[PDB]
Amino acid sequence: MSELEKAVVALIDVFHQYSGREGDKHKLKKSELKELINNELSHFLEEIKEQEVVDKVMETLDSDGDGECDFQEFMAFVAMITTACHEFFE
Amino acid sequence: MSELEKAVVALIDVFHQYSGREGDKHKLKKSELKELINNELSHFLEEIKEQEVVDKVMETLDSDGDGECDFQEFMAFVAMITTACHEFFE
Ligand SMILES: CC[n+]1c(-c2ccccc2)c2cc(N)ccc2c2ccc(N)cc21
Ligand SMILES: CC[n+]1c(-c2ccccc2)c2cc(N)ccc2c2ccc(N)cc21
Ligand SMILES: [Ca+2]
Ligand SMILES: [Ca+2]
Ligand SMILES: [Ca+2]
Ligand SMILES: [Ca+2]
């Protein structure tokens, strides 16, 4: 597969590596989202060390209000992070 | 870097491999978008062989109406493709 398809595959895989840890295996709860950011986005986002930051990130990306981040909400988060990186440089 | 960061990097790179071919080097015109889909998404999207399909895809993703796909519009397209794949399986 192409580099773009490898990226799509990796996005799906990372989501599940974190969503499938606890509770609803199809969504990210706060602790899963914190670990995803801290382990997988260390070059793009500041490490999260405070509950208030976890809470604010989840609040910002939880579009449907159910308290967790589903796959569509995760992809919107990825788009936001990627666009912010691009805008930093361009 | 992590697998997620490699994916972010690949998304930026593929965009530029296609946007930087012709005209505005920061946006995808129709021909650049067609080649991106045909060369890089052959496992996820049907090959485009008709002008009418090119036109419809651009119309659908060109949120700001300027006739080209910028980086933010491309990331929305990636999110849409990735979410559609996920929903096919889940
Ligand atoms: C069955 C869907 N699906 C896919 C999946 C497979 C193929 C394409 C898209 C997603 C998946 C893909 C990866 N990498 C990691 C975990 C899961 C997963 C985990 C749980 C579940 N209940 C469904 C899951
Ligand atoms: C200067 C921005 N920037 C980046 C870039 C570099 C680092 C981070 C994000 C984007 C870039 C990254 C890749 N892979 C391929 C092409 C370009 C590119 C091409 C043209 C341009 N005028 C700016 C460009
Ligand atoms: Ca979970
Ligand atoms: Ca939600
Ligand atoms: Ca161009
Ligand atoms: Ca546009």
Side-chain angles (χ1 to χ4, degrees), chain A residues 2 5 16 40 43 90, chain B residues 2 5 16 40 43 86 90:
Chain A
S2 70
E5 290 175 332
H16 282 283
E40 313 306 341
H43 299 96
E90 318 190 42
Chain B
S2 70
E5 290 175 332
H16 282 283
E40 313 306 341
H43 299 96
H86 196 261
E90 318 190 42

Side-chain angles (χ1 to χ4, degrees), chain B residues 12-51:
Chain B
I12 292 165
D13 189 58
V14 51
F15 178 82
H16 282 283
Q17 284 164 13
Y18 288 86
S19 69
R21 293 175 168 205
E22 296 182 34
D24 185 329
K25 303 300 175 77
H26 316 279
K27 303 182 190 161
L28 299 163
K29 64 168 50 179
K30 285 173 177 179
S31 62
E32 292 168 337
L33 178 62
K34 175 185 174 177
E35 303 295 1
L36 187 153
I37 289 167
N38 286 349
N39 293 335
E40 313 306 341
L41 291 166
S42 67
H43 299 96
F44 290 81
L45 295 175
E46 185 162 1
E47 184 184 352
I48 298 176
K49 302 182 176 183
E50 289 288 359
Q51 188 70 47

